[PDB]
Amino acid sequence: EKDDEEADAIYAALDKRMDERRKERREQREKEE
RNA sequence: ACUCUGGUUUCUCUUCAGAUCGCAUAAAUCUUUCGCACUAAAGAUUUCCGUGGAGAGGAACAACUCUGAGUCCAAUUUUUUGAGGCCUUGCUUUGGCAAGGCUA
Predict the structure, then answer these.
(1) How is it modified after translation?
(2) A14: left (phi > 0), else alpha (psi -120 to 50), else beta?
(3) Interatomic distance A23 CA / B102 C1' (Å)
(4) Which nucleotides in chain B lie less than 7 Å from some protein C-beta?
(5) Cα distance between the two ends of chain A
(6) How is A1-33 classified by DSSP, letter by letter?
(7) Residue A14 CA to B67 C1' — how many Å?
(8) Separation CA A16–CA A19 (nearest Å)
(9) CA A29, C1' B21: Å apart?
């Protein structure tokens, strides 16, 4: 639903906010590995 | 001994951090080793608990402590006198200079 989709977008933004802590280095190591 | 910066507290955001980033110490995955892997070790990657540095914004009272900066000597030994005057020679830039001999 509209509220449900807004909530899912908000929570996805929350989750992507968090791995940003090591996002650059984690993604670089994963690409190298 | 006169004037001027810089504050501190709190909330949020951005970046770097191998520094006991933490006087503490978790979990997962992969590899290797041997056992035969909770009762085991090594290496690597990740995630989490949560920190320092710098920068940026917001909002609350302290504003010159501190950090800095700009702002009483006359008696030996130094700054309260042994100072001034005469003579010769070389050159006179004819003012006298240079050395020596003197008198005080």
Answers:
(1) Phosphorylated by PRP4K during spliceosome assembly.
(2) alpha
(3) 104
(4) 16, 45-48
(5) 40
(6) -HHHHHHHHHHHHHHHHHHTTSHHHHHHHHHH-
(7) 45
(8) 6
(9) 21
